[PDB]
Symmetry: D2
Subunit: 391 residues, 4 copies
Amino acid sequence: KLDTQLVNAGRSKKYTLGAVNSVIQRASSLVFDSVEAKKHATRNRANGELFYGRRGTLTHFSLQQAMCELEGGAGCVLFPCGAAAVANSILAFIEQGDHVLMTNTAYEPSQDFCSKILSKLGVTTSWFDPLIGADIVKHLQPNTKIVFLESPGSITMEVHDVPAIVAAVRSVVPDAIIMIDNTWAAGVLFKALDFGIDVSIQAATKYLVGHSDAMIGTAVCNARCWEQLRENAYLMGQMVDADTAYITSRGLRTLGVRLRQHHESSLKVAEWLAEHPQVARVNHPALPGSKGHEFWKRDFTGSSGLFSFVLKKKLNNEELANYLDNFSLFSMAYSWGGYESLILANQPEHIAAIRPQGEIDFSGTLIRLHIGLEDVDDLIADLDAGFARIV
Amino acid sequence: KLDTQLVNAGRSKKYTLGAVNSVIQRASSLVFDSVEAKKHATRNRANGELFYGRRGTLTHFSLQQAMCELEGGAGCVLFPCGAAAVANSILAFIEQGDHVLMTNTAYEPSQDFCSKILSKLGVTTSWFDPLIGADIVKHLQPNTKIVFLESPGSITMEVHDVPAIVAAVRSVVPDAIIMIDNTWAAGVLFKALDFGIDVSIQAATKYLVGHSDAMIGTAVCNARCWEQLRENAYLMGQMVDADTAYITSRGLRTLGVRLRQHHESSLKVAEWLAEHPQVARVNHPALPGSKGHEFWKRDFTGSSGLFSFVLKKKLNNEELANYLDNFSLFSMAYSWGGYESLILANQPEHIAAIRPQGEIDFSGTLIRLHIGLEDVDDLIADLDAGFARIV
Amino acid sequence: KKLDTQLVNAGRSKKYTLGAVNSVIQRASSLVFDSVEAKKHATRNRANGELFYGRRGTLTHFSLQQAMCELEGGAGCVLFPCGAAAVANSILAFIEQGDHVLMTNTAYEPSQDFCSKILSKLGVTTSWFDPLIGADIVKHLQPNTKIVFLESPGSITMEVHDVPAIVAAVRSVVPDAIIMIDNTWAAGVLFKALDFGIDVSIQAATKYLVGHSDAMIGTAVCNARCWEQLRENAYLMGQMVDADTAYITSRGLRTLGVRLRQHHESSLKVAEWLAEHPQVARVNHPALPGSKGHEFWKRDFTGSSGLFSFVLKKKLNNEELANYLDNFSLFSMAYSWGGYESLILANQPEHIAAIRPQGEIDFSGTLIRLHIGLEDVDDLIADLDAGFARIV
Amino acid sequence: KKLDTQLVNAGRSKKYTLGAVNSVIQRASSLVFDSVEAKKHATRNRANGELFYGRRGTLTHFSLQQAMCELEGGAGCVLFPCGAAAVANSILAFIEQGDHVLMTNTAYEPSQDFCSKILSKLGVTTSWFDPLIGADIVKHLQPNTKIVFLESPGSITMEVHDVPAIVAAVRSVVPDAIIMIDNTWAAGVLFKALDFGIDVSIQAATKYLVGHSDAMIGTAVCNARCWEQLRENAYLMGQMVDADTAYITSRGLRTLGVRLRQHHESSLKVAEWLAEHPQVARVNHPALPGSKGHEFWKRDFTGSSGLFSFVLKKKLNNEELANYLDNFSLFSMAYSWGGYESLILANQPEHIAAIRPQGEIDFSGTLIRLHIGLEDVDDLIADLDAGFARIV
Ligand SMILES: Cc1ncc(COP(=O)(O)O)c(C/N=C(\C=C\OCCN)C(=O)O)c1O
Ligand SMILES: Cc1ncc(COP(=O)(O)O)c(C/N=C(\C=C\OCCN)C(=O)O)c1O
Ligand SMILES: Cc1ncc(COP(=O)(O)O)c(C/N=C(\C=C\OCCN)C(=O)O)c1O
Ligand SMILES: Cc1ncc(COP(=O)(O)O)c(C/N=C(\C=C\OCCN)C(=O)O)c1O
């Protein structure tokens, strides 16, 4: 029934007014017919009553309802981008003197936010290995306020054993807020809230939008954390425009057919690379032997299309240009989650720098690939040609 | 030449590609043709080179260029709304142990951000009277990092003597960052940066958009503050969508003809209210006898259309409903800066609560009015009718 | 009550805005019926503002249609993809093989080409008349004349018709003629066509209603007599406009008053300056005395917009034209007009003569058409004066 | 190389994307010329992808036009406000008074009404033929037959033409006929019309190309022989589509492959289930054996989409129809199709008979048309089965 949910989520007549998709209500000012109406809206300003554009319009409410039913939360808070969803969700719960424990495989800017902004506000951050499991208790402090997860991890793709981590945390620091950047799973391939996680964050910019042309972040919360996240994110003036909200609800409609193709093509490319002579290791959660694959297998209901692989050799500057500059179907660009395939290289030194209190375990150039909706065989032929270029 | 600037700002062929308005480039992913191109874009990622959607696309660059030339700054940082521009601009400069001095007439949520978020991060905030002038030195502390101005003040409209305030601050705490919420003047009727102010903030949501259908915030900085504001706002993931940026550059084009009408009609309504039997006081910066009118006269080059007036009596709940519920041309709604006229009432107790370390000086109901583009005589006839309703 | 108040509030009922200041944007092809009963009711009112199918429109289109009817005082408003679509389909909606179309020879060129390239192969004939024919237009009326097409001011050359004379003359001979007017220059509000007995007022809303040079749309406001036929035949041709453009046009209306007063005030000052200039042979501005039809404009209109033209005393050659046109800094070379930026276009006498059917032009120097935008007028005057110096 | 790879990359050259993945949205009426030289060059190439005027298009339109030509293999692609506009204006572009139009009697109804209500008053006659006439279509050809209009599968009833037979038959008699086809059901990619000798392939891109029920647009991809005439005459009628809809359609193309495979796989499973159902008289699905034209579909197409219909053994009365239609939870009642949600519409035999010119229908029970969306097929089957139970 996921396909049915995706098609129907947030589509109440209150929001569609007869149309299939919700109406786009662009507004800052929202008019009150009377003093009584104004009083009523004021009281319900955070409960879906039209009050002021910063809180949202019908278009925002439709998307919020959809996100809550898809991820099973008590409320959904919207942001300009995923990076804003991360930074502000963390900021809504911290106070001078708190400690933030974050996986060392977190998206780089999430780490930078902690070490550059939080540090100057009297908050300390320490990092942990993705595969630590129940031993995470060795990193918990009495002042640990937030435990920040990201599975699969950025770039290297390690999958956490979320259940073990959550049990260990609840037993030591029950009051901690456990957050996860659940972007890779698009919030549906891994039901974060069902595993005891308080807040599931997404750079909806990726698979929810699915077309590389809108930026937005979401934070679906459980009943325990919603109000504080909502109200504090609001004091920071966080919101997203009505059109992007519309485009995001629109992306959900094809989320199922897209993810199935991404899963199928990326897995096929992964198995092919795994058997290739110039490839040292393939980091794809659905692929056996990949770090945490066992947890992906037990906890997830699917795969999306982003993964990486490590070459047997470290390419020099000329080899790198020769390799990357001549692809036909893969484009060099940041982000992912769209219909077109993307490729980016990372040297071992680059990764070593973004793995705090951790150690890198490969020596060849790492290539991150996003497998789009093109024909898988055409993509493979393009990769094979690339290999021949650095042979 | 303001009219000519407004029509031409940010309209380089690089952004228009032959069109009159800039193209709308929606994107998260931005493609690099080669490794060399990628390296070049990386190095210039903050200098207008296409790099990644979070930094912006051609559409954002066009708006940034326009804002910088109109306000005379070194750079312009964009936000989801004015409230985000305020909260994040302040956050980019503070550190645990700092002190924030803010005018007590600041927009309420700007105050709440300070007392609710900043307080828990080891930052203290104290407030000051709008008309304090050079005596502001009595509130400066050695750890005063930010001095936050707002002229005219929200709701009550007091105008600061910015030059006196800036001189006093520079003489005691040279390193302080002086910020101003320059929304009422739409950044053009008061050139904040020419008075020694470091950052001019705007809820572009108001007069720049001018149609009540988009939310955005801008922060134009001097060369001294730009980089830190830019980079820190970026770690918080602050940005605005490409379409809203487009709509904002589009609003600038008619900014001049709109402001002249707003100025002319609001001044006419102000002079009429000032002579009305049921009105105790009219708070309009352009109107003689208004708090700080002398500074508005010396420092500003015009007026916009927002102002307030105080009735001779405090309306009871029935009188209030009877008065507000039966207007024909004024709508009850938040925000302002659009083409339609708006009205909102505030009891003296409500204001007293949002004037920290200050005292309220009126006892009658305060009515805030935004004078739109309707026929001024029709608006006056509607107000007169309202008076007759509470006579 | 007054125009400005009407412009601000037209079409903005709660039914379309739902609490917001502007109407909602309802993008749709499919519109859902809750029941067989609801479907029946919508079908029966599919042309009277009940949601039925996107080709007929959504809430957003109805808001604009209502604003247009209110402003121009019509019984219905039909929407098209652009102004040329409005002209071509409005004419097509009323003709049959064997009908005759009488059109002003100052009609916008594509309007002429439609008649002589499309209409002709369908057995419809077209003849033209001088804008200033007035009551003498009876000499061109035929028994099979179905449509009389006016355009005041005329395109490029700006002649104003003595509409009251033309209408009375035509109604005395062919009472049942369908009189139409391309009322783009006046933006439908500076000249109330339907009050003068005209049947359909057409506008390339692309110009002043949108006001920013970034959207295209055509409108046709009709009296009660002509509404159903224009509506249904334009519908059979699949004519419509997207919801977003409808929103932007409704949005353009809100500042139409303040913008028009600025275009009027500014173009007039430029016209007066040009009039007294040594290198200008004549200025064709409806608001300037001695201009063709000035007294009719003065009598029938309630304002002016910013487009007009003037004639140089000299007919520029190729090098002089490039040196003149290529070096402007405030006037851009581009088609269309009605926006916030100032535009300039040049026409040689032979180009205009080529598009003045059954008529003779009255000038021999290069004609310059100017659209006066919202820039500072003294800056605009300075830019032109530099242009004059490149010609000497 | 393969379809999916083509769908992802079609029309996306750097010239239109400027570094982004999708083409830029260039909203414009006015397009500025830097010099007289640049204006001359743009004028001369105004119809060959050089920025000239918004009515001709901007970068955004050119990106889509290029994608469409590539996908359907045409020489040019013309854009319209909607599918009905594409059909009506494509026909109008080629006829003259005295011409004859031969159209399938299973053509979408408004396509028929255009011919019999508009074309007729311009001296053009129209006759119809059975979808399955094949090579016997020669019996309806006249010396003045200018256009042969096909629509396979036919609207509502889904008959598939034996196009290769029809084309050869027509070319043997009237070589210079302009053969046109409404290729909406196949989304222009499941049946390559231009490869079968058809001149113009028309689509209501509103359906599958947009794929989300929120935008309207019509396309006409032409061979080299018919491009200029369709283009220029559609232009004289002011036909165009807004830049934003062009962007959304280009965007719809990218997921067209994955969506179509799901519509095919799902509708087929529903068709097979319905076929074996006690209350179903017949199932009209081109991919289902025993369906009209199945072997032609099997032979000429490369897939199926999600729209089809079936006939109940009973002809429902008013109460039964409401009880049936009003209680569905997954199928919405609405016009159009081609999106992500499942839709249902009912037709009585007399309604269809009323729109089957010079033909006889072959059923007597209530006909139900279904659009199978992207929902879970077992959920869809369950909803229908509950409907069947309300009828018993
Ligand atoms: C897991 C994950 N979370 C959060 C974010 C931030 O979302 P945004 O703010 O962009 O909507 C990203 C974006 N990740 C990429 C974007 C990088 O852009 C380059 C500059 N940092 C990427 O290439 O992996 C991400 O990969
Ligand atoms: C001077 C000033 N600065 C900043 C802001 C915040 O901008 P925003 O985030 O909305 O784009 C406002 C909005 N002020 C109003 C908005 C209020 O909404 C009601 C809820 N606070 C108002 O009615 O004065 C303002 O008046
Ligand atoms: C009086 C008038 N009516 C109708 C139209 C057509 O409206 P549209 O289809 O463009 O929405 C125009 C456009 N006029 C110009 C634009 C045309 O440029 C293309 C070549 N004709 C012009 O330069 O005056 C016009 O000036
Ligand atoms: C095969 C076919 N061609 C052309 C069109 C017209 O495309 P449009 O103008 O709508 O973009 C339709 C629309 N068909 C339907 C929609 C019509 O509803 C309105 C009444 N006809 C339908 O229910 O099948 C169609 O089904």
